[PDB]
Design a protein around this nucleic acid. Structure first.
Lengths: 256, 307, 252, 300
DNA sequence: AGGCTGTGTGAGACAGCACGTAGGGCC
DNA sequence: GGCCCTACGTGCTGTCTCACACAGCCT
């Protein structure tokens, strides 16, 4: 219908005029007057933003810095001033050095192949020793590389449906005092208290049956020193996101 | 009465048109494009320019500076709290064809998949960091072939950035969209420290590159049909399942850094760029993994498969 | 151009194949002849009124009844009132509509009856029916009927009782107005207080998934029980603000 | 170069047949673009078959407040009510055979797909394209505005699935036309289901003074057993825009409860389309029941 | 010679727009 | 009556669809 389209266009134009009325700082029931005032305001103030503003806009969002390296030698031709707030390093340190020196000494095989037409790699550089990972991205021009650099008690133990140890986090060396290897391959029922297996068996048969809901139970675990301690567990069955099948039981053997 | 009344209307319309076409000259665009711009586009561009300049003057307030945009592999896009885009990077044409002039100022909800109008709404409105995926309309095919709007194919962007509040409260979101390259048409080189893979729908290893043996230690033929969830460290299971859900419901994802169990103990950090396949229904999922470091803590043993 | 033409050709081929499958009896030309011949044997709207009624009564699962606008009298009622409302047509003929509904719902019908209408009532059988209809000259109204050990209790973040269903009288023994205002841990066994406290301070952290525990619950007569509770925290769908901790108490 | 100039003319002479035979006026039946003819013939044959398998009269459709619709496993509407034009700007002729997935919001496709597949009763809310402006003037499909439809029915199988859904619309609170009664009080809720403006009629029906409800969360009045249903209804209202609840008990001021039924609605800002507040209409289905018991702390 | 696919053509109906006149409403 | 914002529609162009015309193939 022509009338509906015309009405929609008129309403859109009126809304835009109302918005421009508030946008102009100087400004008033009019349309020609408001347009003239907007033009006059715009007189005081080719691309929408100058090249000096896009840099700030990109730095605020991506939170990165521009660096330049030479393929033949790897010397840092230029580093943006924003390197200091990111890596806490003065421009002097980065300048005049080699990019291979500013990375931990096992990822050199990546940069060596990358530098020697688009480039993109993930590496780690020293933080003036804490190491951080930055997603370097950029292109290659006449031969030099230009690329901005962006930025980013208890022990979990899986189980089988029967109750076998299919995983042991490294924290078990201290939380329970047993080496991870020893616990693997043995049912969790054996390590339980002499006569407490009923509670654990019921909990294991219920966690797999109650449509996968978290359960909590307390028992008396043993230790290499032959002492009884109360450690709680939080058991819930993992489910495949798509197929929706039982993968394993995740138990967090929290210690009281 | 009628004769004089009509005459005034003609003069008013002529004056309005003259002022409208004089305003467009002020915009920072070439006269050629400015002259033929319709009135609504002129108003939208003026509004966007004023808003962006106000934001830059309020909050965001040289020899080698122009290279910044070219080095960046995405395109900046400022979005207000109402969904309006007050500025799009000039280099958005390459990734999506839609030129800056055509798209600038339009509502963001009009150029995104309807199913993704809730994630954007949540992210725009207020810890001031954002990292989310979105589906945006495109009009450029592979290798570059502009087509009409109605033939648009949705693309997935890894949107990153931080919100920013500027006193008039008004809040403008700044994002850095990055399209994810399709593995079937890789353009950047693939360095040595990488091994391709191909998993089934429910994340089961169906085919692994031969480099895995040199990188991790598992044989290419040793991991077929085994679920991938049996290898990830138990601490990264939540992140991995979130990434898998996003892959299922959005086509492509870039999973965050996690830890994958290797052979004879230890683990190596990995980053995965998933990509679903659509049969001209889904068929299979590929992945382009990365390796960040050598095996750590080789002596320690975690899973039964390593004993 | 090419893609559009290919899609159109594929759609036409699919339609031809479907039409061929539909007919009982080719070269893509005899198919249309057979289809038109078959249509001629059969068979101005798509379906007759009776055929439309046979579908409406199977979808809505209601009936039709006519009532007067003067004294709530019934002139005619569809025969479909036998399967539903469990009653014969004899009662629903010459009687008054106000006498076939709940006594407390007379005012609603009286106001609604006296050009569209809609309301909800409960005819005798009690059931719930969503009456809808209009008004036509006769004045009469035409409208179509239609048809549609555990112990629950809420809790605050700390654990103070805030709501208990009437089933507490049988499940435990106390009255519903006694448990309110008293912490659940007070009613638990002294030995099991630690587990319940840990679960209550952990459920808030574990938001979105239910948590289950076990302990001993008292009763009106001094003794011990075994109650398994499945407590899950509640969050607003929009604001995502912790409001209350549901506790679907179960007896085991 | 004779069969091409002969068969094509022959096909049109045949395609005009199978079109005039359709149960439609000859004038309208003679202006179909060689595809709607089949789209209607196949649908008519399928609905006649399904009709045969299943198998004041002309007043049932008029009495009904919704439009009957039939959907098969694929999603091809094989029949629609003759009165669909009243609610939706589309008509039976041009919307009989098109895939249902072509006239629904993309986010709502999953619910329909689940519902179609084979407990036979079904009940869901879906958004269907509407081209009827508020003023009542029909508009072209190129400017369709989404409309929420409340659908009920039961899946059926014929000698091969099917579906018979009797969709109805939900009246807008601000454009109400059906007369009210003495047991209906309006109310306004904040976006998080927080009371912000309550009609003065609750003081007579429930037992709460109007000044005692402004601010308190709504979820602290529903009975515990209905919390899941109310949460689902509120989520549907937030995601879609309009929802009709079931039968949830409401706590009184001195004990017991009174049943209710809510028809929520959402109001959108006209400057940025940001949702403002939730408006609801409440019915009452009975009086106070079990008045000699105390459930919550407030009633105590 | 039978139907089947791949290819371009002219013609009717379209939305986009701008610009007209006109009631009608503030002074 | 003095301006000034709204309400419907003439004409126009650039697009949309649809059915009509040559290439070619196993029975």
């Amino acid at each position: 219908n022509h009338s509906e389209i015309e009405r929609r266009r008129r309403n859109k134009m009126t809304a835009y005029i109302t918005e421009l009325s508030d946008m102009v700082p100087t400004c008033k029931p009019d349309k020609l007057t408001i347009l003239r005032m907007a033009v006059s305001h715009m007189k005081s103030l080719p691309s929408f933003l100058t090249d000096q503003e896009l840099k700030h806009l990109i730095l605020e969002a991506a939170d990165g810095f521009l660096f330049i390296v030479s393929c033949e030698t790897g010397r840092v031709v230029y580093v943006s001033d924003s390197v200091t707030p990111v890596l806490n390093q003065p421009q002097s340190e980065w300048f005049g050095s080699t990019l291979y020196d500013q990375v931990h000494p096992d990822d050199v095989d990546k940069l060596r192949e990358q530098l020697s037409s688009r480039r993109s790699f993930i590496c780690r550089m020293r933080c003036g020793p804490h190491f951080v990972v930055v997603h370097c991205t950029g292109y290659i021009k006449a031969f030099c590389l230009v690329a901005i650099g962006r930025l980013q008690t208890e022990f979990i133990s899986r189980h089988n449906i029967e109750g076998i140890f299919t995983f042991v986090d490294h924290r078990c060396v201290a939380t329970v005092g047993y080496q991870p290897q020893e616990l693997l391959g043995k049912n969790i029922v054996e390590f339980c208290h002499p006569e407490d297996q009923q509670l654990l068996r019921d909990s294991f048969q219920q966690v797999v049956k109650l449509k996968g809901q978290v359960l909590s139970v307390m028992f008396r675990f043993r230790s290499k020193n032959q002492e009884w301690l109360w450690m709680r567990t939080s058991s819930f069955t993992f489910q495949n996101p798509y197929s929706d099948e039982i993968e394993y039981i995740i138990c967090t053997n929290t210690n009281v | 009465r009628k004769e004089k009344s009509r005459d005034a209307a003609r003069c008013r319309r002529s004056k309005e048109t003259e002022v409208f076409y004089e305003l467009a000259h002020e915009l920072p665009l070439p006269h050629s494009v400015s002259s033929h711009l319709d009135k609504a586009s002129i108003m939208r561009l003026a509004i966007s320019f004023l808003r962006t300049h106000k934001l830059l003057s309020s909050v965001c307030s040289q020899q080698m500076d122009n290279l910044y945009l070219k080095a960046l592999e995405g395109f900046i896009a400022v979005v207000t709290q109402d969904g309006d885009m007050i500025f799009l990077s000039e280099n958005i044409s390459k990734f999506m064809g839609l030129t800056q002039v055509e798209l600038t100022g339009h509502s963001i909800f009009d150029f995104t998949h309807p199913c993704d109008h809730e994630e954007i709404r949540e992210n725009l409105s207020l810890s001031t960091e954002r990292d989310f995926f979105m589906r945006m309309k495109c009009t450029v095919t592979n290798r570059g072939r502009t087509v009409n709007l109605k033939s648009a194919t949705w693309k997935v962007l890894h949107c990153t950035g931080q919100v920013k509040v500027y006193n008039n409260l008004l809040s403008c979101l700044i994002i850095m969209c990055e399209p994810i390259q399709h593995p079937s048409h890789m353009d950047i080189p693939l360095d040595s420290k990488t091994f391709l893979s191909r998993h089934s729908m429910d994340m089961k290893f169906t085919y692994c590159d031969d480099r895995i043996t040199e990188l991790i230690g598992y044989h290419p033929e040793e991991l077929l049909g085994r679920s991938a969830y049996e290898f990830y460290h138990a601490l990264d299971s939540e992140n991995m399942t979130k990434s898998h859900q996003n892959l299922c419901t959005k086509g492509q994802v870039v999973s965050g850094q996690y830890r994958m169990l290797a052979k004879h103990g230890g683990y190596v950090w990995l980053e995965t760029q998933g990509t679903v396949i659509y049969n001209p229904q889904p068929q299979c999922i590929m992945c382009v993994n990365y390796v960040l470091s050598e095996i750590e803590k080789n002596d320690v043993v975690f899973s039964m498969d390593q004993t």
